[PDB]
């Protein structure tokens, strides 16, 4: 399995996906046909091996396969770890899925375009979302250096070295790439091998995991007799799951009784485990996993339990409707082309509460200095007291990050 989850953030079309192509060799598909004409839309996914050419010279020593005869000589590169990416989209309004994604990440790579005016609306928006959430392991990258002057990718490296200054990003190193022709990527591999280090996760902890996809393996027309189970798609964060463990999802499906609303936990067994294209018997944090189940795929078709969280069956997790956020605000709206000042929060207003991987909306009942209580629509399964959350508003038709904080229970 992959050891660690790395984001690829940045502005729209700056080539976040193309840089996941040049490292993994895997494309996100670019799909929905509408993504095949737009660009990446659902969260991409791709894995690879990072060895190291011990018997040669760095950074070109940093391989992708067990093959060192590429650089210096043969001595089959000692394998260091296997990894996995999560490619967020770059378009301004697909803010609500990149946040969602960011509940799973152990580190990131900021893909700035060398041929556009540096602080681009989303490049920043993402960055401060990073600084907010706690993803303190960043590596900036200057992407399209194959279509610019040799003066131009330096003068921008000024602009990056000056923005990256008053912000927390000390020596966050800026490795210029060319995701297109896969030149100077092995030096990006040396960055990610040094700076984005493999954290320790205590396995004895309560099994908890997030979900960001889930799919009907059933092709148009698999017969009933070999109807494989439904498939939940997401990343473990704390613990390790095993093949043939009893499980529950939360908040889980809601019933209908004449206009009423009522969510409830669903139970099932782990039918199968798989990482990449290879099936496993256990699963551990870092990486996005997938869990074959025995529940009706109608329940997990398009991506129905998106935002849900998986835990042990017979575990202790509150399914809140109403919640106490301790919070703070950005002084600006780093997101809009325009930097208009974030107003102070008004009661009886609509806001988009990102908690974990779930992207709920909710209404504000109380407003203190830094303690607000939010009634919701679709519940939230609050697995701990250390639930980072992110707070957006509708400024002008398109949803915008404005404050953050922690969930209190």
């Amino acid at each position: 399995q992959p050891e660690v989850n790395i984001g690829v953030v940045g502005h729209v079309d700056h080539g976040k996906t193309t840089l996941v192509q040049a490292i993994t060799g895997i494309w996100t598909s670019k799909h929905s046909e509408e993504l095949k004409r737009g660009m990446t839309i659902k969260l991409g996914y791709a894995e690879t091996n990072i060895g190291v050419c011990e018997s040669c010279k760095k950074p070109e020593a940093y391989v992708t396969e067990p093959s060192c005869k590429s650089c210096g000589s043969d001595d089959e590169p000692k394998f260091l770890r296997r990894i996995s990416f999560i490619d967020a989209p770059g378009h301004e309004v697909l803010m609500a899925t990149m946040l969602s994604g960011a509940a799973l990440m152990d580190g990131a790579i900021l893909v700035v375009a060398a041929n556009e005016p540096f602080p681009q609306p989303q490049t920043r928006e993402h960055f401060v979302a990073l600084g907010i959430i706690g993803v303190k392991n960043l590596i900036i990258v200057q992407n399209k250096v194959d279509v610019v002057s040799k003066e131009e990718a330096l003068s921008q490296y000024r602009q990056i070295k000056q923005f990256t200054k008053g912000t927390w990003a000390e020596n966050v190193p800026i490795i210029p790439v060319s995701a297109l022709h896969k030149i100077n990527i092995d030096s990006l591999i040396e960055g990610i091998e040094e700076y984005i280090k493999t954290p320790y996760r205590d396995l004895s902890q309560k099994p908890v995991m997030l979900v960001i996809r889930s799919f009907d393996v059933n092709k148009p027309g698999t017969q009933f007799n070999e109807l494989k189970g439904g498939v939940i798609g997401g990343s473990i964060i704390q613990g390790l799951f095993k093949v043939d463990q009893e499980i529950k999802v939360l908040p889980g499906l809601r019933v209908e009784k004449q206009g009423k609303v009522s969510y409830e936990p669903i139970f099932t067994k782990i039918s199968s485990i798989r990482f990449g294209d290879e099936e496993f018997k256990e699963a551990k944090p870092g990486g996005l996993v997938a869990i074959g189940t025995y529940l009706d795929p109608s329940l997990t078709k398009a991506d129905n339990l998106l935002g849900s969280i998986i835990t042990l069956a017979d575990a202790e997790v509150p399914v809140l409707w109403n919640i106490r956020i301790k919070y703070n605000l950005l002084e600006r709206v780093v997101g809009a082309k325009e930097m208009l000042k974030v107003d102070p929060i008004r009661a009886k207003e609509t806001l988009m509460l990102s908690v974990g991987s779930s992207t709920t909306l909710g209404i504000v009942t109380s407003v203190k200095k830094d303690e607000i209580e939010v009634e919701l629509r679709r519940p939230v399964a609050v697995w701990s007291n250390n639930i980072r959350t992110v707070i957006s508003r509708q400024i002008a038709g398109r949803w915008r990050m404005i404050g953050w904080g922690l969930v209190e229970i």
Binding site: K348, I363, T365, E375
Partner: peptide, 22 residues
């Protein structure tokens, strides 16, 4: 008329009572 008003009053009540309930 009183049709009107009853449902207007009801909608006002609900919508507002929705805003109170929320």
């Amino acid at each position: 008329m009183r049709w009107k008003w009853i449902k207007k009053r009801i909608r006002r009540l609900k919508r507002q009572r929705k805003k109170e309930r929320g």
